């Protein structure tokens, strides 16, 4: 969402002024910028951020300028290469008192969603917002039923890191028509954890970085788990894999989008590791590398260790889509593709 | 193959000396280095290249040393993490008179395969070789039937850029047993051609580079097709896509592993382009970007232009595997995965 232009927006907010903020809420026909793309017009007229590829920037700028004057938020559809819904609002300390706290949450890696009414029959509702955390909600949409419905749905989207327009009836009845709410999620970068610092881990970590994951490579062997060997990994740790995973779980440093790749079949490490991983309250993906021989030998060993067929059903083994690729690069792509397929973008 | 250590090997060859060369011919249980990985021991004893991850390097070194002394080539199997077949031979001007010419072919981007007998009942055959081009073959395995069979199969592997052990009967009878021939292919980097220099082309070109392709980005629009916008593409050209493709075909600068991505649906460019691409004697992949609406509209337009259902069957549209991914990064991965799936590594 506003992460691109949040420093500039915050500085306006802190100074006491009003920014005009245009947020892309919905997109059709492959418009250039996605749900959450933001443009900010400072009181002195300076613009940052982008909502399109140039196509309607001038029009959004004028709208943002007009909206600051009237103080009335506006949903506008632009049609040109795509179709774009842009919601334009005045953001000040008066109109958005929580913005500083949200800036602070984004900085401290506390997940937070903002849910805004962008469409309603009663015009007084437009631009009302909820600030939603896991454990908390602030603000009011104007009705307990609306607050209840949106809070719930926003937390679900937040947990997934998703931003979307949800549609309700006027009192927040599900499947009703007439009220639309944009949920804009600010979740930290999801984690990819790679256990086994063999050379192939570098290829896995480059695909994880390409897909937007923060990648930790972890191996009990100091010679292997080295910054030099993995210079692009966000983090390289020397630990027993299962000790590291269990510690992340306990710290709440892993969430529902966390992705685990097991690149070892050393029984000393892989079984205790998968004993932990396969028992975690669900994380996005748990893959294990190996040929078909390694795969079946590992399954035998995991059954022998006490894993249930239901826990084993969580495991993607052998890892990746079967695309027929031979090289480490092809295998890395097959893994990234399976990860995407399992969550459905 | 020897590309890693070819400079060092060539310098030995040119000086009049004999190098001991160990080439990994076959691998099982995910051994660290693939078919073609080479180790070279210079007369002064200096080693470069690698056949394993450290596991049998000392043993291969001693074998290479012994093979230079006896002058007799040896196939050796090593079992440890994997299983490795390593073929060790003495390489000099006397024993391998074509090596200089092959160095020259690799440098000029002329595809060339070397086919060597690694196993035979008649020990005199071991280490005999054919040097195979598209249009030429030098050397003799010792029989017209063997030369005929291997030449044919080597050209097929060369055309695909593949290195493999092929198995024949003693006179080169297919499906026979007893004779094994390593074909080591030296083909240039395969090309990925990306037509449409939109921002998403960068993501496509990073995956192509990751997979080992040399990437050309091409667009008729000078503002778009720019080195600055695509700093990692090997090449960025301003041309009508169909004019560029047709010129590559005529020049023989595209081969059977060439991969084409069409990222435009501008009728001015895409139809003439696909008129050329879909009619080329087969190239590996021809994908076209678009939503389902764009896909069907483009097909209508291509039927209208005269494309046959058989030509249209060559087209991968909408592009990529359907993995459900939304971001440009996910789409890029889905495209790389479809490319791999279509060739089967």
The residue among A224, A6, A295 whose CA lies nearest residue B29 is: A295
Helical axes A328-343 vs A200-210, angle rounded to 10°: 40
Contacts of B30 in chain A (CB under 8 A): 291
Residue from B213, B336, B342 whose CB has the most chain A CBs within 10 Å, to mutate:
B336
Q: Which of A199, A207, A345 sits opposite B325 (nearest CB)?
A: A345
Same domain, A121 and A5: yes
Contacts of B323 in chain A (CB under 8 A): 337, 340-341, 344-345
User: Do the beta carbons of residue A116 and residue A129 sit within 8 Å?
Assistant: yes
Tokens of A105: 């949450």
Range of the domain at B4: 1-190
Q: How many residues are present in chain A?
A: 345
- The pair phi, psi for residue A117, each rounded to 5°, is -75, 115
Same domain, A230 and A186: no
Helical axes B99-108 vs B6-15, angle rounded to 10°: 140
SS3 B110: coil
State which residue of chain B sits closest to A344, comparing Cα positions: B324
- The pair phi, psi for residue A182, each rounded to 5°, is -90, 120
Distance CA B308, CA A296 (A): 47
Contacts of A327 in chain B (CB under 8 A): 34, 212, 345
Cβ distance B293 to A321 less than 8 Å, yes or no, reads no
Same domain, A6 and A24: yes
Helices (H), ranges, chain B: 6-15, 57-70, 99-108, 144-160, 200-210, 241-251, 267-277, 292-304, 309-312, 328-343
Tokens of B321: 């595997």
The DSSP element (H or E) to which A186 belongs, if any, is strand A179-186
Cβ distance B334 to A340 less than 8 Å, yes or no, reads yes
Structural domain ending residue among the three candidates B190, B216, B239? B190
Ramachandran category for residue B132: left, alpha or beta (phi over 0 → left; psi -120 to 50 → alpha): beta
CA atoms within 13 A on the CB side of B63: 21
Distance CA A62, CA A82 (A): 20
Q: What angle do CA A242, A247, A251 make, to 5 degrees?
A: 150
Same domain, B105 and B71: yes
Contacts of B207 in chain A (CB under 8 A): 210, 333
> Could you give the C-alpha distances from A30 to A84, B52, B293, in angstroms and in order?
9, 48, 11
Cβ distance A212 to B326 less than 8 Å, yes or no, reads no
Residue B195 bridge partners (DSSP): B218, B262
Distance CA B139, CA B162 (A): 21
Same domain, A217 and A335: yes
Q: What is the CATH number of the domain that holds B242?
A: 3.40.50.720
Same domain, A114 and A204: no
Q: Does B54 touch chain A (CB under 8 A)?
A: no
The DSSP element (H or E) to which A137 belongs, if any, is strand A137-138
Q: Does B83 touch chain A (CB under 8 A)?
A: no
Q: Does B329 touch chain A (CB under 8 A)?
A: yes
Contacts of A34 in chain B (CB under 8 A): 326-327
Would you list the DSSP string of A187-254? Answer: -PPPEEEEE--STHHHHHHHHHHHTT-EEEEEES-TTTS-TTT-SSSSEEEES-HHHHHHHHHHHT--
User: Do the beta carbons of residue A279 and residue A311 sit within 8 Å?
Assistant: yes
Same domain, A237 and A195: yes
Residue A38 bridge partners (DSSP): A23
Distance CA B301, CA B297 (A): 6
Distance CA A95, CA A76 (A): 20
User: Do the beta carbons of residue A177 and residue A166 sit within 8 Å?
Assistant: no
Residue B238 bridge partners (DSSP): B219
Q: Does A333 touch chain B (CB under 8 A)?
A: yes
SS3 A60: helix
Distance CA B58, CA A126 (A): 75
For chain B positions 188-217, those within 8 Å of chain A (CB to CB) are: 199, 206-207, 210-212
Same domain, A207 and A317: yes
Distance CA A39, CA A47 (A): 7
> Could you give the C-alpha distances from B317 to A322, B32, B265, B302, B323, in angstroms and in order?
21, 37, 12, 12, 14
Structural domain ending residue among the three candidates A175, A190, A205? A190
The residue among A343, A306, A328 whose CA lies nearest residue A316 is: A343
Tokens of A189: 């970068």
Q: Does A325 touch chain B (CB under 8 A)?
A: yes
Helical axes A99-108 vs A6-15, angle rounded to 10°: 140
Give me the resolution in angstroms, 1 decimal. 2.3
Structural domain ending residue among the three candidates A190, A211, A230? A190
Contacts of A341 in chain B (CB under 8 A): 321, 323-324
Tokens of A299: 């399954």
Same domain, B156 and B267: no
| Domain total in chain B | 2
Residue from B30, B162, B339 whose CB has the most chain A CBs within 10 Å, to mutate:
B30
Q: How many CB atoms lie within 10 A of CB A85?
A: 21
Same domain, A15 and A40: yes
Tokens of B167: 């198995």
Same domain, A160 and A197: no
Instruction: Calculate how close chain A gets to B17, using CA atoms only, in Å.
Output: 34
Instruction: Calculate how close chain B gets to A245, using CA atoms only, in Å.
Output: 26
Same domain, B161 and B276: no
User: Do the beta carbons of residue B82 and residue B142 sit within 8 Å?
Assistant: no
Distance CA B49, CA B40 (A): 6
Q: Does A292 touch chain B (CB under 8 A)?
A: no
Q: Side by side, which strands form the sheet with A164-168?
A: A137-138, A129-132, A112-119, A179-186, A164-168
The residues near A36 (Cβ < 8 Å, ≥ 6 apart) are A1, A2, A23, A24, A163, A184
Cβ distance B344 to A324 less than 8 Å, yes or no, reads yes
The residue among A55, A301, B222 whose CA lies nearest residue A278 is: A301
For chain A positions 268-287, those within 8 Å of chain B (CB to CB) are: none
């Amino acid at each position: 969402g506003v992460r691109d232009v949040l420093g500039t927006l915050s500085a306006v907010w802190e100074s006491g002024g009003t920014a005009g903020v245009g947020t892309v809420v919905r997109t059709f026909r492959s418009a250039p910028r996605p749900a959450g793309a933001s443009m900010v017009v400072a009181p002195d007229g300076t613009v940052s951020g982008s909502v399109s590829g140039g196509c309607v920037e001038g029009a959004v700028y004028d709208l943002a300028t007009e909206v600051v004057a009237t103080g009335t938020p506006v949903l506008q559809r632009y049609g040109v290469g795509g179709i774009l819904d842009v919601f334009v609002e005045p953001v000040s300390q008066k109109t958005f008192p929580q913005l500083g706290a949200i800036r602070d949450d984004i900085e401290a890696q506390r997940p937070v969603a903002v849910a805004t009414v962008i469409t309603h029959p009663d015009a007084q509702w437009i631009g009302r917002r909820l600030v939603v955390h896991t454990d908390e909600v602030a603000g009011s949409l104007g009705s307990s039923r609306a607050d209840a419905a949106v809070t719930d749905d926003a937390r679900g989207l937040l947990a997934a890191g998703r931003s979307e327009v949800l549609t309700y009836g006027p009192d927040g009845q599900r499947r009703g028509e007439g009220m639309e709410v944009f949920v804009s999620s600010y979740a930290p970068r999801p984690r990819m954890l790679v256990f086994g610092a063999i050379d192939f881990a570098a290829a896995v970590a480059q695909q994880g970085a390409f897909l937007g994951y923060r990648v930790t490579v972890c191996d009990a062997r100091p010679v292997f788990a080295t910054t030099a060997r993995f210079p692009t990994a966000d983090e390289v740790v020397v630990d027993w894999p299962h000790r590291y995973l269990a510690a992340q779980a306990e710290a709440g440093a892993i969430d529902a989008r966390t992705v685990v790749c097991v690149l070892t079949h050393d029984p000393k490490f892989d079984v205790p590791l998968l004993e932990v991983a396969l028992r975690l309250p669900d994380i996005a993906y748990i893959g294990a590398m190996g040929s078909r021989r390694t795969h079946e030998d590992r399954l035998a060993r995991l059954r022998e260790a006490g894993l249930t067929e239901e826990e084993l059903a969580r495991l993607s083994s052998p890892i990746g889509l079967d695309l027929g690729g031979r090289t480490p690069e092809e295998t890395a792509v097959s893994i990234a593709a399976e990860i995407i397929a399992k969550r459905w973008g």
